[PDB]
Structure formats: structure tokens, C-alpha cells
């Protein structure tokens, strides 16, 4: 029809947005023509999504942006950056977020790598560390990336949830990040706001509000909570008994299983009782699948083969 299919989809989206925001109705608001400091938060969050797309969970998350602090030489502030040929140190002031530490869900460190056409080596592996207090180890590895030093400028992003989570609970442990060259030759990648000083380095903190703070459809949940709604169902295939097959030597069978049950359009799980993906016509289907190994013969020669998407491990309404 493409008639009801589109309208049922629009209407599911209406309830999905309000549900994810924990709103019972749209909030009756100004209609201005908005501070650019507010648009920058939205612009960075959108852009980060577009970058990660160049490859709790349900409820909406509020996003806060924390820029690299500005340095005033007349003030008594310690500079936010320090420099060695092999690494860079960058520290964010996240003190205004300490009252929200329990609501943190994810934190991203976003820094713009500048093009360095004078770079000697064209590729470098760079590592992100969380600096620790000391005696003891002085840094904790977070992540690493290979970068093209001479390539056109690009945004990089790191998951730094663990480090920021610690900084919000213990201000005394905020010694900043270290962006270091991977050494098993100087650091040849350059970064906006760090080297040579829109492209300011910043943190994106995703928070679940307390008022929103107030079970996957897998074997652990479904097999212990039998229900008519969409859920995993057990099914064992015996190759000889059920298929009449005797050419597979191992395994004699496996629990392929399947997904079955009701998916509503509008010990309980929300993935079973609401329409989380806002489908126009929700259907109970597999979410996570796993491969299967088999050993069979075609005469004298043994064959060990791996077959993808053979075992159903979880379900979803879609």
C-alpha cells in the first residue's frame, strides 16, 4: 500500500521520540531565529555521528560539550597543553560536571588532526593515554589509531568514558590526556588547538537524566521467562533423525533455535513490550546470529567448514 505503511511508520516515530525522551506529550517553547554556542553543541554531536558513520540504550541521552579551556597569561591558570617532541598533553576542566557523575553513560574525546604537508613519515600510529597519579604506573592506555600525517584534515574521536568517569568522581585524578607517538622519530601528526595555538578540541559527554534513570531477548532471559511475546525459542536439529543425513560426522546436531512471538505496535523487557525501532509492522526476527562448524567427508577427504548465521542467539521486534 505504501499508504498505511508510511503513516504507521510516522505514527510509530511520534511515540518513539516522546517515549525515548520520557515525555507524555510535546512540550508546549520559544521559536527563535538560537545562540551559536548552543548550535555548536548540536553541530558537534551531529558531525560526530556522521564521522563514526564513515566506517539506557533506549532512553535518550543528554549531550554536553566541554571545550579545551582558554588560557589567559595574566591569570594564574596552568596551561591546558604541554609539549614534547614525542607527545602532547591536553587537560580539560570538567569540574562543572562533577554533580552529574552518576548520570554519565559515554564520553568522546574529539580532536581535529591538521594536515602536515612537511611530515617526514606519511603514516604514524598515535596512542591516547590517561595520566595517573604517582610510586606507581604513571599512565593508562585508552586507544590507538593509525593516521596519515600528510592527508587532508580530519576529525578523530576516542571513547574516553572510563577516564572521564574517574575525573568526575575524583577531581584530584584529572591530570589530562597524553597524545603520544607509538614507539615499540618525532610526533608528526598535528592537532588544531594544540599545535600552532571552530576546530577546538573538546569532550562530548552523554548523560542519562535521573528522571529517566527511574533484558535482551536471549536464552538467559527468554528461557527463564516463558512468554507469548517475541522471544527466543529452543530448537535442536538432529542431522540424522530430523534430516536423514549421515554425511556430517561432527556435530551430531546443534541448537539452531528460532524467534517467535507477538510484537506490539504500541519480569518484562521493553524490547518485547514496546516498538523500540518504531516499525510500521513489527515482526519477531533474529538479532544476533552465530556460525557453526561442521566436519563431513566427500569420500576419503575430510572437510572442516564454517557456516555463518546458523545459530540464533537473540531476537528483536522489527
Amino acid at each position: 500500500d505504501m499508504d498505511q505503511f508510511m503513516r504507521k511508520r510516522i505514527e510509530a516515530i511520534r511515540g518513539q521520540i516522546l517515549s525515548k525522551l520520557k515525555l507524555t506529550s510535546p512540550p508546549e517553547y520559544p521559536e527563535p531565529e538560537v545562540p551559536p554556542e548552543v548550535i555548536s553543541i548540536y553541530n558537534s554531536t551531529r558531525d560526530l555521528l556522521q564521522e563514526k558513520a564513515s566506517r539506557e540504550e533506549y532512553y535518550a541521552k543528554e549531550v554536553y560539550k566541554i571545550d579545551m579551556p582558554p588560557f589567559f597569561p595574566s591569570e594564574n591558570a596552568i596551561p591546558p597543553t604541554f609539549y614534547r617532541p614525542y607527545f602532547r598533553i591536553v587537560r580539560f576542566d570538567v569540574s562543572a560536571m562533577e554533580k552529574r557523575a552518576s548520570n554519565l553513560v559515554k564520553a568522546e574525546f574529539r580532536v581535529f588532526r591538521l594536515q602536515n604537508p612537511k611530515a617526514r613519515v606519511p603514516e604514524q600510529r598515535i596512542e591516547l593515554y590517561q595520566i595517573l597519579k604517582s610510586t606507581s604506573p604513571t599512565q593508562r592506555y585508552i586507544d590507538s589509531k593509525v593516521v596519515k600525517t600528510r592527508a587532508e584534515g580530519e576529525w578523530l574521536s576516542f571513547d574516553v568514558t572510563d577516564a572521564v568517569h574517574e575525573w568526575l568522581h575524583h577531581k584530584d585524578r584529572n591530570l589530562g590526556f597524553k597524545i603520544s607517538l607509538h614507539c615499540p622519530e618525532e610526533l608528526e601528526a598535528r592537532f588544531a588547538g594544540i599545535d600552532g595555538t571552530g576546530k577546538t578540541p573538546h569532550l562530548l559527554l552523554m548523560l542519562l537524566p535521573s528522571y529517566r534513570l527511574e533484558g535482551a531477548l536471549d536464552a538467559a532471559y527468554c528461557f527463564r521467562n516463558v512468554q507469548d511475546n517475541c522471544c527466543l525459542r529452543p530448537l535442536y536439529i538432529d542431522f540424522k533423525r530430523d534430516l536423514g543425513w549421515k554425511w556430517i560426522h561432527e556435530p551430531k546436531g546443534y541448537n539452531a533455535n528460532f524467534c517467535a512471538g507477538a510484537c506490539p505496535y504500541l519480569v518484562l523487557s521493553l524490547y518485547n513490550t514496546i516498538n523500540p525501532e518504531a516499525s510500521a509492522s513489527p515482526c519477531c526476527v533474529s538479532q544476533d546470529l552465530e556460525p557453526l562448524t561442521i566436519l563431513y567427508y566427500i569420500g576419503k577427504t575430510p572437510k572442516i567448514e564454517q557456516l555463518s548465521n546458523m545459530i540464533v542467539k537473540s531476537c528483536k521486534c522489527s
Partner: nanobody
Amino acid sequence: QVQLQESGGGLVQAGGSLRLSCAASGYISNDDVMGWYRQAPGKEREFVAAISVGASTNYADSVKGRFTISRDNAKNTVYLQMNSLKPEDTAVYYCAAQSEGYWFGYWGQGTQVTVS
């Protein structure tokens, strides 16, 4: 707790060198940032240089290529090597230490530097 004593200042001719040193009396952590500010008479404190984790440094634009900050963690001493001295560098130079917060909280009484 924390006490800072500067020395090495004096009157030099432009183009000459001078080495400042700041001895830290009390307890300072190697993680704690140390640095130098300078205050011309009447004018306000001005960041010059600071040293941090992994002997990492940060320099004011006016002293880049001429000043070197270094640190002897074993004796809790920071040095400021001043080469190619200019009249613009004439000020009282204060050494500073990080207070337990990301700001300079401890200050020595300062040493004069005059460049002819």
C-alpha cells in the same frame, strides 16, 4: 608544606645570558606543574614557562627560542635558562607551583632581572 625560593637574578646587558633557579622547600609531587611568571613594575603577572608530566613544557610566545625551563625532580628544583636577553624581559621573576587544583597556588618572593 610548600615553599619556593628564587635566585640567580641580576643586571645583565642585552644579548647576554642569565640562569634562574627556584628551590622548593616543602613537599611537591613530580606530577605537580612548576613554572615561572614575570611582573614588570606596575604591570601584572605574565606567564613565562611551565613544566609538567614527562618533562613536557609550555612557553610564552615572547620567550620561545630563547628561554629553557628544566627541572631536577630529585632536588625539587626548576631552572629558567635565559639566553638572548632583551630589555622587554626586564621584570621581577616569580616561580610558581601547582596547588592541591589546576592553578598556580604557591609563589616565591621573586628575583629581579634587569636587561640593559
